[PDB]
Design a protein around this ligand. Structure first.
Ligand SMILES: *C(=O)C(CC)(CC)C(=O)Nc1cccc(CN2CCN(Cc3cccc4ccccc34)CC2)c1
Ligand SMILES: *C(=O)C(CC)(CC)C(=O)Nc1cccc(CN2CCN(Cc3cccc4ccccc34)CC2)c1
Ligand SMILES: [Cl-]
Ligand SMILES: [Cl-]
Lengths: 812, 820
């Protein structure tokens, strides 16, 4: 077996090769189905959606017409009608009025379509909402009880504005923009850094869905909101976008072990008169402190209202993220904010002791709670019950849907006597807990995956891995008599689905390893003898695939039975034009951290197109989902709890050796490893731990030191740093710099200079320690499109010079 | 001619080689007379010195004997002046009449007495801590010449005084609130700001008046002239921290070019003391009119102080473009008390005479630039409306020469009663007499410790100069009354740095040459009885002896060549050790090539530039060339690159390289590297950028890549304001020309300290921005927790290792040629 050496191109030649082979658009999303209700017309529904019609183009609202019937000989390809005349990330909509509300650039706008006004046959010039406010407005939302009112955030405070009367009003006075950020570290209605970055919650205020009627023929609107105080949170400096303006932007980063923000709930209570004028605005706070009522709660993971507006709800986590509580909060728990201590005591006495927080569900785990967007609340039939669907990995170690009924008891605790409540004083007895689904597979509830409930047929639609861990599929099952789980999506593809609100259609964005992404509309229907049985039928195409592009050769998914007692899956890019009796240099691409799966049956020729490019130059490319990876259940994921950096490279090496024994073209002498973020971290660990296996390591934005990363992430997987002193040490490459090679041309560090999730300090502290330890490195910095081209060029060239070509074999 | 290829050592082996192949000489001298007829010693000398190796800098003394055995060589012994502190001393004060030393060692401020009325110790004295109530580090202590019981110092950017007998402490300025943040509180007093320290070498910002003023009580008044600065309009910049654990950035005020400099003014603290040394009162006083009115056009207070009598406070002032110097006498009567009440403030202005006025006793201009220097000697004032003084200037002849100047102190034409602003030349004085003491194609030295000693008895002036050569500094002497013959006092084949006794009967010289390490030796001055002008020198004793030519270090040969520019350009050449016949070697050009610096001269370079020899041992030719713009050749030679930085320098570097390359066949022009720090890093980039043909690799260290990111004081002196010179700034900024770099990798290495506060990392990061935009390759190395230069030895060790290894892998070795 002779060594194959890659063609040694020049820098300018490699730039040309990358430029030629380079030459995507946001696929249709945020679907909404509106009925036409037109007996004489040919269309049943209009679908509205956000999309990008070309690659240059900006993201905007489109519509398409769903016909009542189709020619089943042909394939109907739906046309994209523009709804409007900068760019839109999301949109709100009120059904009854047909009002869209959306931000585009700095402006907030509104149009109407598909309400009583009817259905336009051409673009709509939208109406700009007026404002006195000097700064950018964020997070606009229509009031569900009155589409004339909207809310939004300006300078970390909540405002409301009437789109008819033009009345604007600031609701919270929590942030003063002109003062310094040391004293004023407060905010209302905005989610803090950790909650956005690590729990995917972006909004921090919620309209009450219904309005209460006043005595004099007006109404009361309500906004539940989160108020944060980040005064005790660590302040860190990262260099500003403008390098000519030599300064640093301050922001609050709760690093692991330190304080999270000081959180609490609030309610704005807005009295409006008979003709839409604001009478009064009472701001209201909890009767007792957040720490007392919600003992142990550190993070407000999720929050909203019940469909009737009766209770606000919230899904709450402790600091270790091992205990989740779903908690109903009455509006009567809130009293007006009064600085006068005598008048404050009055208002506490006026509230009954019966009014109390209601923990309607609690769960625990020795691993961790993964937060998700599934939580469906049924309408309240009985007065002292709440019925709902939730998902959990805590029973079986796999995420499944459960139908739960809780009893809303009077609390044992009484506030009159004025003590502190015990841990379980607000817990509700669980009357029923039916498991809707079960097995060695999971229901999906993140990154857009959720459920749709058909209350009439008493069915729930959900996405899952039942058929395979490498394919997402749409399923349906009864929540009343749960049994047979009907699949609705076709095997051989992975699907991301959106079910119509009327449960009579669904859209699926699907692909597989060979075929690019497509979006198609499927009609749901039942046989006459049984509404429980659900069948699907292709209706029309919304987006066609480009068709497998000859320049891109896809990988083969493989798998091996690991000594760890798990099947591990991988992707293998065999080199283009294999020579018999030769062995090629192998580049292992890695991520390997939690909340990610790189190996699955989806089209990888957009995101990971440049893996195919490495294979065209003569490299073998391997990707392996090690233990900790997503979509295999909680026990699989928990493998590295307290032990980050200590099991991942075993699984990689094991898979790399499995491939080697079966394919003689893999040259274990010339193996490189490369990844970004956790992949960059593991790449450093690979070179540190296994010099023998890995010749080169390219680390991108690597986490080098876990005490520098945030609370929400790090404490979930590694606990508090006091209770895992060794794991934090052994898991931190910056404090083991002595273990790196004394040879140069084996370590490449890549970092963005301004990156604020994985800070540059991770790289700069490593560099400092490598210099202390007399170790070599190579460094590329990317301050501030053009730099991604530079990155790909440098990486191809670095692999060429130090792994692929004959010059690399000489160099040693 | 075969190419020599250097040994390809591993990283571990180069670390070994460097590790294997890996102290302040006496200074701040002071002669004090014994006045002991029966004793064997004429003088005792005091001096700062590091006794050797890992040891702190401290006060020593030695004994100067009346006679010597001229058969033998006397070696003086160093007596420790101080005892161990129940850290190190950089600087000291002395009061002649009392014997009081004053100095800072570590945090504390101390005093001893020796050589005054109390006599001379024969054993180390115990230093006496000056006690304090101040919470923070005290800085810049200074003895009051008028009363050696009193001292002054800076604490939290304000001026304080402390009596060392009575123990009375007192705050004189309330300009800086130490507790409030620096974004609001950006004022200071008695402290030279960044640009003044970094670009004009002025460190102090307050000056004791050297004489007291007696009162009716039998007490006295003491005065302190001081600079007050308001940096509120000055650009703020954030650099990280020695603490990398806290992801945080510390702020400071950096006047970047074409932006606001600090808003400055003069102030005076009037300090009334009673009959037994207790403070009665402290009146803080300000100028009767603004600084912008009284000193029209002035932007930098370059130097300041008092006349010997304490009558006038002098100052040397510059305009923003640094093409106009003004020496100005400021009378104490120009200052009035500070007053909020605008009626009472007006009444004090009116009580001051109109005859009292600033006196511009000297003014000069140039098309090139003013170079500030420490030479300025005021004579005692005998005539009432005349001041007589020695100054130095390049503005007449284009070489720095001494001039004895007398100016007439006329009452001003301008009058303050009328209430108009004065005309540009209302304060100017008549120049009655301006005699040139020296002249020629050579300069008098007045920076970096070089100065003059005036013998007022025999009416002579001692000075350092380049008269015998630009490659050697020598001590000379000449009359200031009948200026004729310039007598050299130091021996040739040696560069000297000399300190002349206050009594003018001795001088000490620190000297070296290319082959011999540094030495310090004492020399007695005397004249034949018939003629006191004729000054001769005799060796007296050795203070510091040579370690000797160390056999690791082979010196370089000083070469020179006639450039097409019409200047002789001097250089140094390190030939490779064991130079093979019929073989050619990879060359490494070390460069600085910026203003205010000369790399090529006849001094020992085996300490500072030791690794140029290490390069030669591995088989590299090493060249160094002082191009046009460099120091010690006159203002015209220096002026060559005004408005044109980065354009002319490499022409001279390549010319010199080719002078050697034609004259020596061992110089392989196909493999030439370049390397430098600061301006040398700048030029290293420019060299590769402009001359891809000549230079294979460039290793730029802390490079200036964008002149708009550098400070006012430096950049505007050589380039003017950016508004007036858009082409100069564009053509002189490598960041704006990133497209011109090679599109071959392994030819560009950037080295930068992450926390550098003179040449900010910003220069490197913005260069990397434009190189990425231009699709160009680079290599980069960062050295965190390190400011101006590389202080931590492990990072210095890493710097030398990477630099040597980089040259090996991409220039010197077998594989380097195969790699193309
Ligand atoms: C970490 O999670 C980060 C940074 C904190 C979050 C945004 C991160 O993921 N950053 C980041 C930056 C730049 C690119 C990517 C993803 N990209 C996917 C495709 N991949 C192409 C590739 C892969 C393997 C080998 C090569 C070799 C040469 C050229 C391209 C290659 C690069 C990484 C993520
Ligand atoms: C510029 O003015 C700086 C940086 C902004 C502030 C003072 C500066 O000068 N920095 C700096 C950092 C580190 C070292 C030096 C000076 N040093 C002198 C000796 N020289 C040795 C040398 C020369 C040439 C080649 C080699 C090769 C290997 C090892 C040493 C070499 C290096 C620079 C200044
Ligand atoms: Cl929506
Ligand atoms: Cl002195």
């Amino acid at each position: 077996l002779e060594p194959f050496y890659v063609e040694r191109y020049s820098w300018s030649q490699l730039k040309k090769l990358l430029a030629d082979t380079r030459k995507m658009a946001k696929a249709p999303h945020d679907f909404m189905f509106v009925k036409r209700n037109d007996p004489d017309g040919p269309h049943s529904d209009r679908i509205y959606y956000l999309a990008m019609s070309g690659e240059n183009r900006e993201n905007t609202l489109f519509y398409s017409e769903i016909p009542k019937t189709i020619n089943r000989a042909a394939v109907l390809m739906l046309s994209w009608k523009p709804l409007l005349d900068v760019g839109i990330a999301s949109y709100d909509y009120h059904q009854g009025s047909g009002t869209f509300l959306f931000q585009a650039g700095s402006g907030i706008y509104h149009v109407k379509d598909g309400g009583p006004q009817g259905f336009t046959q051409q673009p709509l010039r939208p109406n700009l909402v007026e404002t006195s406010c000097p700064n950018i407005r964020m997070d606009p939302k229509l009031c569900p009880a009155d589409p004339d009112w909207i809310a939004f955030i300006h300078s970390n405070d909540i405002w409301i504005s009437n789109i008819v009367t033009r009345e604007e009003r600031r609701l919270t006075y929590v942030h003063n923009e002109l003062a310094n950020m040391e004293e004023d570290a407060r905010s209302a209605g905005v989610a803090t850094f950790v909650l956005q970055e690590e729990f995917d919650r972006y909004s921090g205020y919620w309209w009450c869905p219904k309005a209460e009627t006043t005595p004099s023929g007006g109404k009361i609107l309500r906004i539940l909101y989160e108020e944060n105080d980040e005064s005790e949170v660590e302040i860190i400096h990262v260099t500003s976008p403008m390098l000519e303006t030599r300064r640093a932007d301050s922001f609050r980063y709760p690093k692991t072990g330190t304080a999270n923000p000081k959180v609490t709930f609030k309610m704005s209570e807005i009295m409006i008169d008979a003709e839409g004028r604001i009478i009064d605005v009472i701001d209201k706070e909890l009767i007792q402190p957040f720490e007392i009522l919600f003992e142990g709660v550190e993070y407000i993971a999720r929050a909203g209202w019940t469909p009737e507006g009766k209770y606000a709800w919230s899904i709450l986590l402790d600091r270790s993220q091992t205990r989740l509580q779903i908690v109903l909060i009455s509006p009567e728990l809130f009293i007006p904010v009064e600085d006068d201590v005598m008048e404050r005591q009055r208002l506490i006495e006026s509230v009954p002791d019966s009014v109390t927080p209601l923990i309607i569900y609690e769960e625990t785990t020795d691993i961790w709670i993964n937060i998700h967007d599934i939580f469906h609340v049924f309408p309240q039939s009985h007065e002292e019950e709440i019925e709902f669907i939730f998902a959990s990995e805590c029973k079986t170690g796999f995420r499944h849907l459960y139908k739960i009924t809780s009893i809303l008891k009077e609390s044992k605790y009484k506030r009159s006597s004025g003590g502190l409540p015990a841990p379980s004083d607000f817990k509700c007895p669980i009357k029923e807990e039916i498991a809707i689904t079960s097995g060695e597979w999971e229901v999906l509830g993140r990154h857009g995956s959720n459920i749709q409930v058909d209350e009439v047929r008493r069915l729930v639609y959900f996405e899952g891995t039942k058929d395979s861990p490498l394919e997402h599929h749409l399923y349906v099952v009864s929540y009343v008599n749960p049994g047979e789980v009907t699949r609705l999506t076709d095997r051989g593809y992975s699907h991301s689905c959106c079910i119509s609100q009327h449960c009579d259609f669904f859209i699926s964005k699907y692909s597989n390893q060979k075929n690019p992404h497509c979006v198609s509309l499927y009609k749901l229907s039942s046989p006459e003898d049984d509404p429980t049985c659900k069948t699907k039928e292709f209706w029309a195409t919304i987006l066609d695939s480009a068709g497998p592009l000859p320049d891109y050769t896809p990988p083969e998914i493989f798998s091996f039975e690991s000594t760890t007692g798990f099947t591990l899956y991988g992707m293998l890019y065999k080199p283009h034009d294999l020579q018999p009796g030769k062995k090629y240099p192998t580049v292992l691409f890695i991520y390997g951290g939690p909340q990610v799966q790189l190996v699955n049956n989806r089209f990888k020729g957009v995101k990971y197109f440049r893996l195919n490019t490495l294979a065209s130059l003569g490299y073998v490319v391997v990707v392996i989902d090690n233990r900790g990876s997503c979509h295999r259940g909680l026990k699989f994921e928990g493998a590295f709890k307290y032990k980050m950096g200590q099991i991942e490279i075993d699984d990689q090496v094991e898979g790399l050796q499995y491939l080697a024994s079966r394919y003689d073209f893999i040259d274990l002498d010339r193996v490189g490893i490369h990844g970004w973020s956790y992949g960059g971290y593991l790449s450093l660990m690979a070179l540190m731990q296994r010099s023998d296996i890995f010749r080169v390591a390219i680390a991108g934005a690597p986490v080098t030191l876990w005490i520098f990363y945030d609370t929400g992430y790090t404490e979930r997987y590694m606990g508090h740093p006091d209770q895992n002193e060794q794991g934090y040490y052994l898991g931190s490459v910056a404090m083991q710099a002595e273990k790196f090679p004394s040879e140069p041309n084996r370590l490449l560090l890549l970092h963005g200079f301004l990156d604020e999730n994985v800070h540059f300090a991770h790289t700069s502290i490593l560099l400092s320690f490598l210099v202390r330890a007399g170790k070599p490195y190579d460094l590329q910095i990317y301050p501030q499109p053009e730099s991604g081209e530079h990155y790909e060029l440098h990486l191809l060239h670095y692999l060429q010079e130090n792994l692929g070509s004959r010059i690399a074999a000489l160099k040693v």
